[PDB]
Amino acid sequence: AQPSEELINMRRYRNAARKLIHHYSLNSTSSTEYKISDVVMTMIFLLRSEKYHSLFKLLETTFDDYTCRPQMTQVQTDTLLDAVRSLLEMPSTTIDLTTVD
Amino acid sequence: NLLTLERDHFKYLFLTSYFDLKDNEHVPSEPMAFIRNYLNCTFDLLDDAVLMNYFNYLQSMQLKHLVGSTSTNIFKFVKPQFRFVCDRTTVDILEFDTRMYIKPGTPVYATNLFTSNPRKMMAFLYAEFGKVFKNKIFVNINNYGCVLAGSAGFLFDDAYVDWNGVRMCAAPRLDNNMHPFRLYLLGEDMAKHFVDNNILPPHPSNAKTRKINNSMFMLKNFYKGLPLFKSKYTVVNSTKIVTRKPNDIFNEIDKELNGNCPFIKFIQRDYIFDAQFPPDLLDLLNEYMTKSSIMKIITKFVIEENPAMSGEMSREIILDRYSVDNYRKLYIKMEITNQFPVMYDHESSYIFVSKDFLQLKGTMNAFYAPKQRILSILAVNRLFGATETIDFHPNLLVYRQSSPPVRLTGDVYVVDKNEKVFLVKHVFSNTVPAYLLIRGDYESSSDLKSLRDLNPWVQNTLLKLLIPD
Amino acid sequence: DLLNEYMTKSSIMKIITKFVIEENPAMSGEMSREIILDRYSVDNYRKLYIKMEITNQFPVMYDHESSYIFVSKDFLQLKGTMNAFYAPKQRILSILAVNRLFGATETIDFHPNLLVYRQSSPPVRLTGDVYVVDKNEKVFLVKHVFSNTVPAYLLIRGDYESSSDLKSLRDLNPWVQNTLLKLLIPD
Amino acid sequence: MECPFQIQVCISDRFFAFPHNLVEPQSDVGNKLIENLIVYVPTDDDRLYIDKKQFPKFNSVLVYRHEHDVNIDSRSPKKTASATIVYWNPLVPITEIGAGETRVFSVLLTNNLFYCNTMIVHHENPKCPIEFTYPNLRPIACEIPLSHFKELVESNDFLLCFNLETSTMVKILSLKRIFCIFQYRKQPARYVINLPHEEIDNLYNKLNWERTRRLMKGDVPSNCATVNRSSLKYIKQAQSLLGIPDYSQTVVDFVKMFQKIIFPYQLVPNVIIKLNNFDQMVSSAPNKAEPYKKIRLFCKNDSIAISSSGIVPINMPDFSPPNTFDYSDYANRTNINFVTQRVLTDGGFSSGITVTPVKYNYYL
Amino acid sequence: EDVDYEKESKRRKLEDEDFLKLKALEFSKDIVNEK
C-alpha cells in the first residue's frame, strides 16, 4: 500500500492546524488565515491517534449544528483537556474549558 | 561401587557447597554423608555422571555469571568458574586504596583456588607465566600477583570482592577463613592456555604427599561462601503474602502498625536477584539466614497516646520477602537470644511517610506540608514510604510580612542576611529533633550561630537544597 | 591453496596509515594482534589477524620507503598529481613533504582561479622558511606540519609579508621540485 | 606513528636533571666501541648544564640542539655508526641513530613514543603540591629552574610566568619538571601562574592524557589534579553559602569531612554527585551529556554496592526492565492530577508546583 | 625467600629521600675557575 498521502507532510498538517487553533483560541497574530484543504487536513490528521479521535468526536458533534452544549463526561473530559494541552504543546499555559467552549 | 546420590538432593548440595556451611545436623543422613565425602574431595569414589548431571541442573537453575563448561576436568584442575568485565572505575579524587590500575572493560575470571597465604607460592605462578610468555619487559611484579600492561595477569583477592567499584571504604570485618583469598585471572589468553594446562600446583606444604587438600591452599567448586546460620525463631504465628504493588505493601504496613508495637523490623534477604529457584529450595533457605542481609527498623510518626494500647511487647512481629516476590509475616515470642543480620551501631531508624507530607524530589530527610505552609528537615532519622514526589521551587518560600516586634528563642542559624532566611531547632512530640526553615522578619536573643557548627548529615542536604543552580 | 603457503619476496608491498588527528586514549595495546590483508586470489582477498612477531620475513623493500596515508573524505587529490591536495571549507592547497597519497577515487584538475589573492590587511608578518614562488603574483611557499608530525608545504597568494630571510628554490627536494614544476603548469 | 626498531625509552622524573652516570659507551657487534659521542638537547642552554669531565670513558663528546629536519624525514631513520648518539628530553621525532640500540631518556611520554620499548623505574611520591590563588611575593626565573632549586627548597610560596613567544610544548616541559621537583619537597609549597589560563585548562587535559599514557605502564599513583574553573568557582560559591572559617581552606577538606557520612548513611553525597557532573568528560560530561556514567561504589566486605540510583546488588548493571514494576495503577496520571489539585487548592498557590512518582531499581 | 621487589623499592624510597641532598654538591659555588 501507499501510506504517503495520509500524513506525508505531517509537518504541514500539524503546523498549519496548530497555527489555526492558535488563531482561534490564542487569537495569536494577524495572518491570511485560510485553507479549506487544511481544514480537511485537520480531520485526517486527527484520524491517527486516540488522543486525537476524542477531540475529533467532540468536533464532529458540531455537525449536528444544534447549539446544545454536550454533557461533561467529567473524568474523560478532564483527560481530554490534558490531551488538548499536550497536543497544543503549550507551556501548560492555563488552557481551559472556557477556551474549549 | 562409587558413592552416588539422588537427583533431588541438589538442593542440599548447592546450599552446603556455596554458602559456607557450618551446621550439618539437619541434612538427611545419607545425603549428608555423601556430601561429606564430596567435601573430602576423594573424587574417585563418586560418579562423574552425577557431577555432570548436577552441572546440568545448575544450567537449568541458571546463574548469571556462570562460566561455560564442557568437561569434568573442571573439578580436577585449576579452572575459571565466573565471568566479569571491568567497569569504568574512572574517578580521580580519592586514593586508589591499593586498588591497582586496570584497563577499562578488560574481561576477567575467578579461579577455583583459595589460599591462606600469598607470597609463599606465587613464584610457582610466575614460572607458569614464564611458560605462558617468552619475551617479557618491564613486568609490574608485586606482592599480589602478575601485572603487565594490565592485560594478562593474576592476583590473590578476597571472595566477595566487587569488580571496579570506586571504593574500598572502611567497614567492619565479620568472616574468617582458613584460605581467605581466591585467585583471580586477567586476560583471556591465559585462561585459554589454562584450558590446555590441566595443571595442579606442587604441594610441599603437605610434603607433596599426594594430599587431596592442602593446609595453605584449597580448591572449591563455585564456593562464594556467603554467611549463613540456622533460623531458630520462637514462631507464634505465620502468614504468607503474594503481591507486587508497594502501595499495597504500605497499606498492609499501616494496618499492622495500628497494632500496639511501636515499631516494625524489616529484613531483605540479598540473594533474591541471583537466579531461578525451586520454591522448595526457598523453603530450605527459610530456616537459615545470612548476617550480611539488609535490615531496617521503621516506626510511625508517633503523635499521641492511646493509653489502652500497651503491653504488646511479648509479640515480636516481622516481615521479609522470603520469596523473591512474596513475603512471610510472622509473630514470634519475644526473645533476646535470637540473632539478626549484623548492622552498625547507632544506626538511625526510619520514619514511615505521613498521609499529608510530600517528600522533596531528589532528596531525603526533608519535606514540606501545605496546611501551615511549612518546610521541615529531620535532624537524624530517614524518610520512608513516599510514593509521589514534589520538586522544590523558591516560590514556596513565602516570607512573612508581620509587624516589626517579632521575637524568637533558642539557637537561630542565619541562612542569608539579604533574603532574611533562617533556621531554628525544634522537637516534634518533644522527642523528634528537626530544623525549621523560615524567611522574613524575625528576631532572637541575638546569639547568632554559624553554619559551620552543624552536622554533615543536615549540611549536605541543605547544600543541595539551596540549589544555587 | 597450495600457493598460499609460500610467498615471493620480490612482490609488491606497502604500509598505510590513517591521517592521525588525535588520541582516543583507550586505543592501545593492540600490537600483539598484527593485521594483514592481500588478494590471495587474483581477484579475492584474505584478511588475517596473526600473533605479533619479529622473526617472520616479508617481501623485500628499500630502506626509508614511503608508506601512504589514506585519503581524507573531505579533501581531493589533484588530477594526474601525487602528494598534492586541496580542501574547500578552508580554501587551502597543500603538498606532503614526503609521504604518498592513497585511497582517493576522483580528482579535480588544478586551475589558476583556485588561488585566492587575499587582499588581507596591509601589514602581515610571517615566520619560518619562506620561498617566493612568484614575486609578480605575490605567491609564496611555507613550511608547515600537521599534528607536529606531518611535514608539508603550504601555498599562499597575497600580501603575507614576512621576515627578510628569503630562501631559494635550489635547496628543496627533487620530489617536491618536480611536483611544483608540473603543478605550476606554466604551459 | 611508526616506532622504528632499535630504540629504547627510559622515563624517570629524575631525568629533569641529566643522569650523567648511567650512560655507557655503545659498541657495534664485533665490540667496535665508539668513543665518539653526540647528545641532542631542546636548547643550547641545556649545554650549559653538562660537564664533559663526567665522561672520561669517551675521548670525543659533542652536543647540539635537536632540530626537526623535513628533507630527511623517515619513519625509519637514517643510520650511522661513527658515533654513539643520545637525545635528552627530545620533543620531536628523530631521524638518525647511532650504532647499536639507541637510548633516550625523558620525563614526558609523547604520543610519538607510545608504541615503543620503554622502562620507567617509577616510584610513589607521597606528597602533592597545592594550587594557590590570591587577588610574600616570590618571583621565580621562568623556564630556567636549575639556578633556583635552592630557592625552591628554601621557600614555600612561588609564582611563575613565560615569555609570550614560548612554544606550548616548552611550557608543558617546564611545568612538568616543576611539578616533579616539587613532589620531593617536604612542604607542599603554594604556587601560582601569571597567565590567562583559558588554554591552560586544555593543557591540563593534555597532562591528564599523559598521565593515562603513563598508567598504560605506570604506578597507579594517587596523582593530584582537578578541573580549575567550573569546579573551582562552584566550590567557592559552596563555601560562601556555608560558614567560611577560612578564605584559604584546602579543596580536599570537603571530601575528607564528607567521608564520615558515607558508610553510615549508605548514600551518595550531593557534593560528589555534582562532582562527576561538572567535568567536561569524566562526569555527567557536558561534552556528551552521558549521565549513565553513574558511580558504582563499594566498601570493605560489602554484600552490596551504592550508586546515584541507591543500593544495588554486587557486580550488576543498573536495573532490569522486567521488575515488580512501578505499576501504572499507582502513579496513574489521573490520580496524580487529583492529588495535585488537592495540593493546589489547599495551598492557595497559583503556579510553579510539579510532582513525579518515585521509582525503583533492582532493589526496593 | 621473598621473590618480590618491595624491599628494594623501599630502598628506592630511602634513596629518594636522599635524592635532594646531592644537588647542593651538584650546583654550589666552585673553588676555582680553571680557565
JSON list of N, CA and C in Angstrom, two decimals, chain B residues 10-29:
[
{"chain": "B", "resi": 10, "resn": "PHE", "atom": "N", "xyz": [20.23, -32.12, 45.13]},
{"chain": "B", "resi": 10, "resn": "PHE", "atom": "CA", "xyz": [20.93, -30.95, 44.61]},
{"chain": "B", "resi": 10, "resn": "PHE", "atom": "C", "xyz": [20.69, -29.73, 45.47]},
{"chain": "B", "resi": 11, "resn": "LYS", "atom": "N", "xyz": [19.49, -29.61, 46.03]},
{"chain": "B", "resi": 11, "resn": "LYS", "atom": "CA", "xyz": [19.22, -28.54, 46.99]},
{"chain": "B", "resi": 11, "resn": "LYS", "atom": "C", "xyz": [20.29, -28.50, 48.07]},
{"chain": "B", "resi": 12, "resn": "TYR", "atom": "N", "xyz": [20.43, -29.60, 48.81]},
{"chain": "B", "resi": 12, "resn": "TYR", "atom": "CA", "xyz": [21.43, -29.65, 49.87]},
{"chain": "B", "resi": 12, "resn": "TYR", "atom": "C", "xyz": [22.82, -29.43, 49.31]},
{"chain": "B", "resi": 13, "resn": "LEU", "atom": "N", "xyz": [23.11, -30.03, 48.16]},
{"chain": "B", "resi": 13, "resn": "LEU", "atom": "CA", "xyz": [24.45, -29.90, 47.59]},
{"chain": "B", "resi": 13, "resn": "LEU", "atom": "C", "xyz": [24.81, -28.44, 47.38]},
{"chain": "B", "resi": 14, "resn": "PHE", "atom": "N", "xyz": [23.96, -27.71, 46.65]},
{"chain": "B", "resi": 14, "resn": "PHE", "atom": "CA", "xyz": [24.24, -26.30, 46.40]},
{"chain": "B", "resi": 14, "resn": "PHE", "atom": "C", "xyz": [24.32, -25.53, 47.70]},
{"chain": "B", "resi": 15, "resn": "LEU", "atom": "N", "xyz": [23.33, -25.71, 48.58]},
{"chain": "B", "resi": 15, "resn": "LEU", "atom": "CA", "xyz": [23.31, -24.99, 49.84]},
{"chain": "B", "resi": 15, "resn": "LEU", "atom": "C", "xyz": [24.65, -25.13, 50.55]},
{"chain": "B", "resi": 16, "resn": "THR", "atom": "N", "xyz": [25.02, -26.37, 50.88]},
{"chain": "B", "resi": 16, "resn": "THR", "atom": "CA", "xyz": [26.24, -26.60, 51.64]},
{"chain": "B", "resi": 16, "resn": "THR", "atom": "C", "xyz": [27.47, -26.11, 50.89]},
{"chain": "B", "resi": 17, "resn": "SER", "atom": "N", "xyz": [27.54, -26.37, 49.59]},
{"chain": "B", "resi": 17, "resn": "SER", "atom": "CA", "xyz": [28.74, -26.06, 48.84]},
{"chain": "B", "resi": 17, "resn": "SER", "atom": "C", "xyz": [28.98, -24.56, 48.74]},
{"chain": "B", "resi": 18, "resn": "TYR", "atom": "N", "xyz": [27.92, -23.78, 48.57]},
{"chain": "B", "resi": 18, "resn": "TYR", "atom": "CA", "xyz": [28.06, -22.44, 48.03]},
{"chain": "B", "resi": 18, "resn": "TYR", "atom": "C", "xyz": [28.03, -21.33, 49.08]},
{"chain": "B", "resi": 19, "resn": "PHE", "atom": "N", "xyz": [27.45, -21.57, 50.26]},
{"chain": "B", "resi": 19, "resn": "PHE", "atom": "CA", "xyz": [27.19, -20.50, 51.22]},
{"chain": "B", "resi": 19, "resn": "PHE", "atom": "C", "xyz": [27.90, -20.71, 52.55]},
{"chain": "B", "resi": 20, "resn": "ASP", "atom": "N", "xyz": [29.05, -21.39, 52.54]},
{"chain": "B", "resi": 20, "resn": "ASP", "atom": "CA", "xyz": [29.87, -21.52, 53.74]},
{"chain": "B", "resi": 20, "resn": "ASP", "atom": "C", "xyz": [29.09, -22.19, 54.87]},
{"chain": "B", "resi": 21, "resn": "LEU", "atom": "N", "xyz": [28.79, -23.47, 54.65]},
{"chain": "B", "resi": 21, "resn": "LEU", "atom": "CA", "xyz": [28.07, -24.24, 55.65]},
{"chain": "B", "resi": 21, "resn": "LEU", "atom": "C", "xyz": [28.86, -24.30, 56.96]},
{"chain": "B", "resi": 22, "resn": "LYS", "atom": "N", "xyz": [28.12, -24.35, 58.07]},
{"chain": "B", "resi": 22, "resn": "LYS", "atom": "CA", "xyz": [28.67, -24.76, 59.35]},
{"chain": "B", "resi": 22, "resn": "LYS", "atom": "C", "xyz": [27.92, -25.95, 59.93]},
{"chain": "B", "resi": 23, "resn": "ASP", "atom": "N", "xyz": [26.60, -25.85, 60.06]},
{"chain": "B", "resi": 23, "resn": "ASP", "atom": "CA", "xyz": [25.80, -26.95, 60.57]},
{"chain": "B", "resi": 23, "resn": "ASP", "atom": "C", "xyz": [25.75, -28.10, 59.56]},
{"chain": "B", "resi": 24, "resn": "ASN", "atom": "N", "xyz": [25.61, -29.31, 60.09]},
{"chain": "B", "resi": 24, "resn": "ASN", "atom": "CA", "xyz": [25.42, -30.49, 59.26]},
{"chain": "B", "resi": 24, "resn": "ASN", "atom": "C", "xyz": [24.37, -31.42, 59.84]},
{"chain": "B", "resi": 25, "resn": "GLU", "atom": "N", "xyz": [23.68, -31.02, 60.91]},
{"chain": "B", "resi": 25, "resn": "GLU", "atom": "CA", "xyz": [22.75, -31.91, 61.58]},
{"chain": "B", "resi": 25, "resn": "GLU", "atom": "C", "xyz": [21.51, -32.17, 60.74]},
{"chain": "B", "resi": 26, "resn": "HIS", "atom": "N", "xyz": [20.93, -31.11, 60.19]},
{"chain": "B", "resi": 26, "resn": "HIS", "atom": "CA", "xyz": [19.57, -31.19, 59.65]},
{"chain": "B", "resi": 26, "resn": "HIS", "atom": "C", "xyz": [19.52, -31.72, 58.23]},
{"chain": "B", "resi": 27, "resn": "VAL", "atom": "N", "xyz": [20.66, -31.93, 57.58]},
{"chain": "B", "resi": 27, "resn": "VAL", "atom": "CA", "xyz": [20.65, -32.60, 56.28]},
{"chain": "B", "resi": 27, "resn": "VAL", "atom": "C", "xyz": [20.27, -34.07, 56.49]},
{"chain": "B", "resi": 28, "resn": "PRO", "atom": "N", "xyz": [19.54, -34.69, 55.56]},
{"chain": "B", "resi": 28, "resn": "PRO", "atom": "CA", "xyz": [19.26, -36.12, 55.71]},
{"chain": "B", "resi": 28, "resn": "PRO", "atom": "C", "xyz": [20.55, -36.92, 55.76]},
{"chain": "B", "resi": 29, "resn": "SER", "atom": "N", "xyz": [20.52, -38.00, 56.53]},
{"chain": "B", "resi": 29, "resn": "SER", "atom": "CA", "xyz": [21.76, -38.66, 56.95]},
{"chain": "B", "resi": 29, "resn": "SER", "atom": "C", "xyz": [22.60, -39.11, 55.76]}
]
